[PDB]
Amino acid sequence: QMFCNQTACPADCDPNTQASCECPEGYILDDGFICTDIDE
């Protein structure tokens, strides 16, 4: 459901696929409103 796409994506909360800014279980956005996580 929530996990951006392509390793890491922005958080365009799409009204049809609301799941890019809600982030996975506390996924936590990034320094570029990209809902993702790799290290720091």
In Å, how far are 16, 23, 35, 39, 40 from 1, measured between CA atoms? 12, 9, 12, 22, 23
- Quick one: 1-40 is in which CATH superfamily? Laminin (2.10.25.10)
Per the entry, the structure determination technique was: NMR
Smallest CA-to-CA distance from 13 within 21, 23, 2, 5 is with 21
Query: CB neighbours of 14 closer than 8 A, spacing ≥ 6?
Result: 20
Q: Rounded to an integer, what distance in angstroms lies between the CA atom of residue 12 and that of residue 39?
A: 22
- Show me where the domains of the chain are located: 1-40
Residue count of the chain, please give it. Answer: 40
Token readout for 39 is: 């290290």
